[PDB]
């Protein structure tokens, strides 16, 4: 896993491009992804 750098990521079949940084949002244990107010996947959780 590479952080603070521009990479291509594939999380459980979800593919995209961007920079992965640490966050402080608190998901619930049954939630996997996160979405913004409209469509974008703002947050994501490492499966491991």
């Amino acid at each position: 896993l590479v952080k603070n750098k521009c990479v291509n990521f594939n999380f459980n079949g979800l593919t995209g491009t961007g920079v992965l940084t640490k966050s402080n949002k608190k998901f619930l244990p049954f939630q996997q992804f996160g979405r913004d107010i409209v469509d974008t996947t703002d947050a994501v959780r490492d499966p491991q």
Binding site: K26, F27, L28, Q31
Partner: peptide, 28 residues
């Protein structure tokens, strides 16, 4: 000792907490 209900299609408004917890709902 037990209750039974049925569901219908409806539009609801939900409130999400600054956690992720749902705290209140409003019918339409």
């Amino acid at each position: 000792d037990y209750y039974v209900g049925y569901l219908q299609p409806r539009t609801f408004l939900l409130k999400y907490n600054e956690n992720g917890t749902i705290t209140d709902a409003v019918d339409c």
